[PDB]
Homo-oligomer: A and B are copies of this chain.
C-alpha cells in the first residue's frame, strides 16, 4: 500500500555529449508519483516519460550529459493526509580531427538547411547529430516567445550557427555565421525577443554572440550571410495540430 521503489536508478559512467536514460519504477495503492531531482534542484534540461501500468509507475528521465551530477528518484503516495516516500539515487559521471561532414538528417532545421549541403558535426560530443539538434531547441527555449517577424530569421540564424556548412577542402572545418547576420537578427528582426533573453553552458553553445563572429566584408567567402527569408501570408492564428486532428475525428464519427 505504501510507496516502494522496485527498479531504481542505475549509476552510469558516460562520455561528454552522451544522451543517457535513467529508470525508476514504483508501486503502491494509490499508485505513487515519481519526481526527479538533479543535484538538489529540479532537472535543468531533460525529458520525462511516464507510464502507469496498473499499480506500477514507470518513469524515464532522459538527459544530455555535459557535467557530472547526482540524480535522485522520489516515489510518493498519500494515505489520508500522510504522505509516504521512497528514495533512490544515481550518480552520472564523465569519463576520459575535430569533426565530420554529413548531410543534415534531423527535423528542427529541415526547412532552413539545404539538402545538397554538408554540415559540420562536432565530434567533441559522443552523439553529435542529436546533441546539435538539441542545441537548436535549447536556443529556442532561451529566445522564448517569438514574434512573426522574428521566427524566420531566428530559425535561420540558429540553424546556420549550430549546423554550419563545411568549408571546401579535405579537413573538416565549419563556415561560421557572419557578424552582420547575427546583428541583423539580434537588433532588427528579434530586437524585443533578444532584450527579454538578456534579462549557462547550454546558452553559450547554442545562442550566438555576435562579437565573436567575422565580418562579411573581411572576406565574403569565409562566413554565412542572412539568407533570403521567404515571406508567407499564413493565418495569424493557425489552429494547432491538436485542434485539427480533433476536428477530423469528429467528422469521422459522422
**Residues of A bordering B, CB below 8 Å:** 19, 35-38, 40-49, 62, 74, 76, 82-85, 87, 106-108, 129-130, 133-134, 137-138, 141, 144-145, 149, 180, 184, 187-189, 191, 215-221, 231-247, 250-251
List 19 A-B residue pairs with CB atoms under 8 Å apart, sorted by A's residue number: A35-B217, A37-B218, A37-B233, A40-B218, A42-B233, A43-B234, A44-B235, A44-B237, A45-B235, A45-B236, A45-B239, A47-B239, A48-B234, A62-B247, A87-B219, A106-B246, A107-B242, A133-B247, A144-B145
A42-B236, A107-B246 are known contacts; what are 8 more A-B pairs with Cβ within 8 Å?
A: A35-B217, A35-B232, A43-B236, A45-B239, A47-B238, A76-B220, A141-B237, A144-B145
**Bound-complex Cα distance A233 to B76 (A):** 13
Contacts A108-B242, A239-B62 given; does A40 touch B215 at CB 8 Å: yes
Q: Which residues of B contact A40 (CB under 8 A)?
A: 215, 218
* Copies of this chain, count: 8
Shortest CB-to-CB span from A216 to chain B, Å, is 7
**Bound-complex Cα distance A86 to B232 (A):** 16
Contact B133 A46 (CB under 8 A): no
Contact A133 B243 (CB under 8 A): yes
Q: Which residues of B contact A232 (CB under 8 A)?
A: 35
Contact A217 B233 (CB under 8 A): yes
Closest to A129 in B: B250
